[PDB]
Ligand binder design. Structure first.
Ligand SMILES: CCN(C(=O)C1CCN(S(=O)(=O)c2cc3c(ccn3C(C)=O)cc2Br)CC1)c1cccc(C)c1
Ligand SMILES: [Cl-]
Ligand SMILES: [Cl-]
Ligand SMILES: [Cl-]
Ligand SMILES: [Cl-]
Ligand SMILES: [Cl-]
Ligand SMILES: [Zn+2]
Length: 209
């Protein structure tokens, strides 16, 4: 039931998304190992993901969370990267595919920094990089990430690794927060797929500095 609406680069909605993507790039602690060395993307395409059933599921859950959290669903626009974008835009996020070994356990991970999500596009820690050149810093091959609506509800703030299966009691999400001698950039984790909607599909390259 998914329809992808291609946005014209002249569209202000396209430009809004690209601006968020470009302006949230950060220098990463790993010197570029996972996601590559760049300070700018070349955006190839931005598509709006239209899926009535997925939207219904997302909205139903958002209403529940809102009622459970003093009428604040705390929706945030956040980036997601993984090798599973094609499945996500058709069937949604599915925590049954999330396993307990992750830094914050069996959840679906999002970032406020696009360059953090870019570290996951080819796998955890960038995997082995692009299929053709096996280069995590490939400047040739195309990449995709999502810019998603994410229902956070009441977030549990976590500063170090804790492998949990579900949000803590009374909460709807976990935020891995920067701390001294800890994380550098925030990571946002939900443990129910229906708390995210894959609003925008971005096709891009990283650019060589
Ligand atoms: C960013 C961290 N991260 C995730 O959050 C994963 C969470 C689970 N997802 S998921 O979107 O729910 C998901 C995972 C899937 C599939 C089909 C196979 N999958 C397999 C084998 O996993 C579909 C989806 Br709809 C994809 C995103 C991740 C990212 C890259 C690689 C891996 C293993 C996990
Ligand atoms: Cl416009
Ligand atoms: Cl980092
Ligand atoms: Cl193309
Ligand atoms: Cl829709
Ligand atoms: Cl897939
Ligand atoms: Zn390549």
């Amino acid at each position: 039931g998914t329809i992808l609406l291609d946005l014209a680069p002249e569209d202000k909605e396209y430009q809004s998304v690209e601006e968020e993507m470009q302006s949230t790039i950060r220098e990463h602690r790993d010197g570029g190992n996972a996601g590559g060395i760049f300070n700018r993307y070349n955006v190839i395409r931005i598509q709006k993901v239209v899926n009535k059933k997925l939207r219904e599921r997302f909205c139903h859950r958002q209403k529940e969370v809102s009622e459970e959290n003093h009428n604040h669903h705390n929706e945030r626009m956040l980036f997601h990267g993984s090798p599973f974008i094609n499945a996500i835009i058709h069937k949604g996020f599915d925590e049954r595919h999330a396993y307990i070994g992750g830094m914050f356990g069996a959840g679906i991970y999002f970032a406020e920094n696009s360059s953090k999500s870019n570290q996951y596009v080819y796998g955890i820690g960038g995997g082995t990089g692009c299929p053709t050149h096996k280069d995590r810093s490939c400047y040739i091959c195309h990449r995709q990430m999502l810019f998603c609506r994410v229902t956070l509800g009441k977030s549990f703030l976590q500063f170090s690794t804790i492998k949990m299966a579900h949000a803590p009691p009374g909460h709807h999400s976990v935020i891995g927060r920067p701390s001294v001698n800890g994380l550098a950039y925030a990571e946002y984790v939900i443990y129910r797929g229906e708390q995210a909607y894959p609003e925008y599909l971005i096709t891009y390259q990283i650019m060589k500095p």
